Every structure is written in C-alpha cells, then in structure tokens.
Amino acid sequence: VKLMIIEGEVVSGLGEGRYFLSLPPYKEIFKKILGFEPYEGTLNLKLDREFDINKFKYIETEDFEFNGKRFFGVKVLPIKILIGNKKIDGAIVVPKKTYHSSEIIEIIAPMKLREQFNLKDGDVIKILIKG
Ligand SMILES: Nc1ccn([C@@H]2O[C@H](COP(=O)(O)OP(=O)(O)O)[C@@H](O)[C@H]2O)c(=O)n1
Numbered sequence: 001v002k003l004m005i006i007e008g009e010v011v012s013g014l015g016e017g018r019y020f021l022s023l024p025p026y027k028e029i030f031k032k033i034l035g036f037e038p039y040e041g042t043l044n045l046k047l048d049r050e051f052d053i054n055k056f057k058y059i060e061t062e063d064f065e066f067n068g069k070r071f072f073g074v075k076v077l078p079i080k081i082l083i084g085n086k087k088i089d090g091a092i093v094v095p096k097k098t099y100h101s102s103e104i105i106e107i108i109a110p111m112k113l114r115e116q117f118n119l120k121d122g123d124v125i126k127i128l129i130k131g
C-alpha cells in the first residue's frame with residue numbers, strides 16, 4: 001500500500017455532477033459508503049494523464065431503477081482533497097462501466113469546494129489516494 005499524491009487542474013463541465021448527485025438513490029449510496037452527504041456536484045479535475053481507477057481499491061455499486069429508468073452503478077474511491085494545508089474528506093467517482101480511462105476525474109465532497117476554498121478554473125489542487 002502506497003499513499004499517492006496527484007495534482008489536478010479545476011475545470012468546468014456541463015453540470016452533470018449536480019444532476020446525478022441530487023438523485024435520491026445516488027445520495028443514499030454515497031452517504032452509506034462515505035459517511036457524509038455530498039454536496040450535489042462533482043469538482044472536475046484535469047490530470048496530466050489518464051486516471052485508471054482499476055489501479056486502486058474502490059467500491060462498485062450495481063445499476064438500479066429509479067422512477068422507471070435504469071441508472072448506472074458507480075465506482076467510489078475515497079480520497080483526501082489537499083488544498084493548501086487542509087486535508088478534506090472526499091471521493092473520486094466514475095461510472096461502473098467505462099470503456100477507457102480519462103484525464104478528467106470527478107471529485108465529491110461534503111461541501112462546495114469552489115465556495116469554501118475559492119477555487120476557480122485553472123487552479124491546481126492535489127488529492128491523496130491509497131494505491
Ligand atoms: N464538492 C464540490 C462539487 C462540485 N463543485 C462545483 O460545484 C458546481 C456544480 O457541480 P457540477 O458537477 O454539476 O458542475 P461541473 O463540474 O459540470 O461544472 C461546479 O462549479 C463544480 O466545480 C464544488 O465546488 N465542490
């Protein structure tokens with residue numbers, strides 16, 4: 001086991017994180033796994049290379065039905081979010097089935113990080129992950 005520190009650049013998406021994280025079943029999944037109710041959104045970070053989550057120990061949930069529609073399970077990887085000298089509880093989240101790795105990762109946390117830590121696009125933060 002190694003603790004890895006990785007840097008990423010804050011970027012904007014199309015608001016997808018707030019869609020999913022506001023849905024009751026996803027809220028419940030994250031609350032149970034992580035022990036906090038995430039702020040409804042994902043802080044999207046651009047890394048210098050693709051992130052392969054299958055290189056880490058994560059929890060994976062199954063697809064589920066909500067109000068007549070099938071939704072995808074998720075892979076959940078606990079992290080610490082490193083902003084200055086603060087270590088903030090969070091997680092990396094990826095859809096259960098992805099067909100390649102991405103240099104963009106989605107981070108969840110108990111608070112809105114942009115608001116609490118004044119992050120803007122292009123700001124670089126770090127994350128700590130058990131590998
Ligand atoms: N824990 C979080 C989650 C999202 N966010 C931000 O909260 C807003 C809504 O999240 P979102 O995932 O729907 O938006 P995008 O990441 O698609 O821009 C965005 O500005 C995210 O960067 C945050 O500051 N802290």
Ligand SMILES: [Mg+2]
Pocket residue numbers: 013015016017018041042043044106
């Ligand atoms: Mg997002």
